[PDB]
Amino acid sequence: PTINQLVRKGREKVRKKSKVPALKGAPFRRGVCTVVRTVTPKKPNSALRKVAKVRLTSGYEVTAYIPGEGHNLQEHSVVLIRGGRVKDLPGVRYHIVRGVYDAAGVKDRKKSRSKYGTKKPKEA
Amino acid sequence: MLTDPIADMLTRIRNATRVYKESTDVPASRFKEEILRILAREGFIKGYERVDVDGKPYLRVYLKYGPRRQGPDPRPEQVIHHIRRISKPGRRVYVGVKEIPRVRRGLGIAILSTSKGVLTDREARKLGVGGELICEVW
RNA sequence: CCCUACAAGG
RNA sequence: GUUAA
RNA sequence: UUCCCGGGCCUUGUACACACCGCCCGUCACGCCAUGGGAGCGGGCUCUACCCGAAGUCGCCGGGAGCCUACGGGCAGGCGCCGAGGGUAGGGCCCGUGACUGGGGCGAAGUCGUAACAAGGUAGCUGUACCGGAAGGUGCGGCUGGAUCCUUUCU
RNA sequence: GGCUAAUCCCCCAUGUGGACCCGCCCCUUGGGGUGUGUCCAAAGGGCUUUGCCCGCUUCCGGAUGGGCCCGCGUCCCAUCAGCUAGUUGGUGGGGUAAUGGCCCACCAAGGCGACGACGGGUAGCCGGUCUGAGAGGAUGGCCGGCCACAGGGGCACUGAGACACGGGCCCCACUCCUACGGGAGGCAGCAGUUAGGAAUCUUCCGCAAUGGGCGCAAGCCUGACGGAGCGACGCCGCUUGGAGGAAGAAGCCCUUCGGGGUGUAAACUCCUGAACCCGGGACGAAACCCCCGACGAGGGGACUGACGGUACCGGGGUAAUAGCGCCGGCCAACUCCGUGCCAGCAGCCGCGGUAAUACGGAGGGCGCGAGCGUUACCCGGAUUCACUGGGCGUAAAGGGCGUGUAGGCGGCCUGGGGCGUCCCAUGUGAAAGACCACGGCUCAACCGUGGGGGAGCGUGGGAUACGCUCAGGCUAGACGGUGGGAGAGGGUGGUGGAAUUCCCGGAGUAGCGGUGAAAUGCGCAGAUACCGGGAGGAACGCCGAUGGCGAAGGCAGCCACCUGGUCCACCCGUGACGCUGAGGCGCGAAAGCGUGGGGAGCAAACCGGAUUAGAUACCCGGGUAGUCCACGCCCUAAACGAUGCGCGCUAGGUCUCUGGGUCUCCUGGGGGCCGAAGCUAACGCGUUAAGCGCGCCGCCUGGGGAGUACGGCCGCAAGGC
């Protein structure tokens, strides 16, 4: 565009949309489990992915993933959401943090333990 | 009617040199002549001269080029490899003496029109003055 | 479990 | 009928 | 050597490339989710008109109605304008809900046909118009982003 | 109701002086001087008591602090475009320290806005901070500056200062106390409670130091502050050991069962000594005060430490925490088993379907280490809003075309001014921070001192090339003159022949029509085919082109009239009168809409015949709107060269339309093809540019959702922007 046009209209700073409306852009959000479902992945994949419908303190009710093999969540389990979507589950944009609230840490987990919330087992 | 008689000249020169013409004419004007003075002095062109084309005043600009060359495409290197307008109608470019650019570490030049007359970037720096940054050459 | 890892069929 | 090589 | 089957060479179109037994469109069915319209129903803001109007400053009175007085004046008190807010009527605006209602996104293997890509089997696309389970079909005009010199879907 | 003191209040006097009216002078907005008139002062207390200290009154000035005013700068939405009555200005008042519609009386009719008013949304602003090569982007916590607020709203009183967080009054909400009349209260001070939240600490010590208020002083107050406590929240420093030690224990993992790995790692030997334990033990603190001196200078003297028995010293002295992420590519690091599109991983690409370096465990490995990961957010990479530093023929992007308003841009020469621009000097640019140097804590973090910075803005002076402005000149752009030219350019009227349909007459008879084949249909009320006549509507064969004209849409028989554009020649006139163009306005294929008319042929819909698995189609027979005209709407498009307009520049060849010329050919305007240089991702473009440049407009910014929803504007509607 001409310089005159640039003087007349300038450029437009374009902003980005959040991939995570956990309101306050808080790093995490608390909520209660409304439903504990199972969901099928998209095309390339097949499996019974574990998801939960959570009613947030942020006034939102979004579905969150329940990572790990374990899992002990029911229709009233209070839990902490963190954000991190699931490439396979369109609509699932948050992960439930294991080891916090009513969400038990994955038991017998021996590797990436800090994720999955699993304390260190005694070695001898 | 031209909108940038200066830009016009830099281009007539640019286009001509690109086809290895011996010389090229440009509508006459003092300011334009002054710029030509430097190109000559700086050895970018053989030189120039007033002439009258069909009754009107022009300026034959005698172009320079390197020697014929080796292999394929024996066309000679250009003396004036780059001649570019900086300040322009509706975007004039002005610089203070500490803002005069250094074209190609000195290998090239800048031509400003100062209140002390048209000067190469060195001539300007020397006389300690800035002005309108007309163009750049190398 | 028969097909080919499945779907669907027996 | 789907997904692969 | 026109035709059926397999094949070789040149060329052309292609949205095909585990390569036409390719690709692929829309309706509909099942599941998840966001969302538009929306009578009525409540919450708030705002503008206009009129009305009521605390405190307080200011202005007038301050009288044979009160207090002080060195008679000049002062205080109390009274009245008024402005005035936080409030009321009634009307107009605009926003938020929540919302019967009923429109379409949309997304989710390996459900249903119907086959619209498009090769002249895709009636060249396609297009603005508009009517019409039809659906893709679409047809009219009129336009564009090339069109191949060349009985009939038949799928995968 | 009564009594009473003062540095409380008042009257009189003195008037250095000051205030006010009027005059004059100087100066220039209300600044300074001067004259007359008028008006205005005061507080006492202490004693080392005949003279000092604290203090009071008036005035001028200083210093510090502040009020008000002005230039410039300060986020998003134009789906916010018109806003305004104290509104804009005046005169005269009120108010204040003071200007001012700050407030009022009256008069005038003004003020503001596309350089974005008004409305809506969001937000305290800076020094700085983070990031970035820079330009820039993001940000404003701690510290410093300014502002604003003190439960919400309004208000004034006191005072130098407030319209006052721990002052006052009223209204509102809320809490508490009430004998129900009526009262009390405001932690956005320190700490602490509770609620909300992913989340943020002690109801600590001290007033020793620095700083503040009151006091002559002693000294009193100070949750300001100086410290301690809690939290890996961050940064920096430190530890968990050092040297020796086997061709190499065991265990565990691989294996080709030979052996390879963990690995000098361990064990074990020796050495040093984090912790701890003793003893010493701070700096921060020397003033105020007191004595001498003169309550000065100067000199002596005394008191005082929260932190803390801490830091730091010296002695003794134990071998004494390691975790977390990761290992398919990006990206450093591979094997075994389990599992079998399951369970699960996943930042993006992707991985798992029975031998998975990608899942889960293990061995091994890589990375970092009192941390390591994750999530969230900011800058970067992203020249991915491109000023530096991008684009639009086919990738997203040229507006359907023109006219032209504001605006942006502007040929050659001379002169004035000196706004832009450039130069010098100078003022400003607080501290902290950043940078460099040196220095203080054993280092560092942290901190001290010093050095250097600049943009921006103010002031004075200077320059004049370019841009600007004024003045004059010019003729190369532009426009005009005269003379010629070609054209389906437009509008109105008239008019010609071919064909179809229909009607009439003649003649003639059994079918015609239609298809792949058929049938519907039409025909003995005589069709088809043929001849003659008539009516009507619509469109113009050959010429005709790869042609011409127009801004696009688009325009085609012939004639007349009215009318637009354009090209060449002659160099005749004007003398930069130019280019572009937001908005506006006009034009704008087809279909469609309204009123009226027309209606031959064609033909959405529709009625039928076929075809087909079906056939809401393609083929066949009919057929309404419509197609045509007038007038008014609609405003779209593959409105396309998918290429905005103007100008200058950069080989040619060939065909062609139209004009001029000394007419092999030269010169101008237009239409094509191939190609120089160059450009392009390529295809291609290439003097009719997509090349080289300048000016202006329009537009793009991943795909779907969606040209949808909402709002506005327009339309009768369909619907358009």
Ligand SMILES: NC[C@@H]1O[C@H](O[C@H]2[C@@H](O)[C@H](O[C@@H]3[C@@H](O)[C@H](N)C[C@H](N)[C@H]3O[C@H]3O[C@H](CO)[C@@H](O)[C@H](O)[C@H]3N)O[C@@H]2CO)[C@H](N)[C@@H](O)[C@@H]1O
């Ligand atoms: N998301 C697709 C959108 O909706 C339409 O597509 C939707 C349907 O038409 C389509 O349906 C297909 C069907 O066409 C096809 N013949 C069979 C197939 N099983 C269906 O599939 C659908 O349903 C199954 C469950 O039954 C899901 O697992 C699957 O993900 C889903 N796409 O699947 C889509 C639903 O996701 C439009 N045609 C498409 O252009 C548009 O983008």
Ligand SMILES: [K+]
């Ligand atoms: K034959």
Ligand SMILES: [K+]
């Ligand atoms: K006097």
Ligand SMILES: [K+]
């Ligand atoms: K003073």
Ligand SMILES: [K+]
């Ligand atoms: K001041």
Ligand SMILES: [K+]
């Ligand atoms: K006034």
Ligand SMILES: [K+]
């Ligand atoms: K800022």
Ligand SMILES: [K+]
């Ligand atoms: K800033």
Ligand SMILES: [K+]
């Ligand atoms: K002394």
Ligand SMILES: [K+]
């Ligand atoms: K020691």
Ligand SMILES: [K+]
């Ligand atoms: K040890």
Ligand SMILES: [K+]
């Ligand atoms: K197995």
Ligand SMILES: [K+]
């Ligand atoms: K593995």
Ligand SMILES: [K+]
């Ligand atoms: K980023």
Ligand SMILES: [K+]
């Ligand atoms: K377009």
Ligand SMILES: [K+]
């Ligand atoms: K338009």
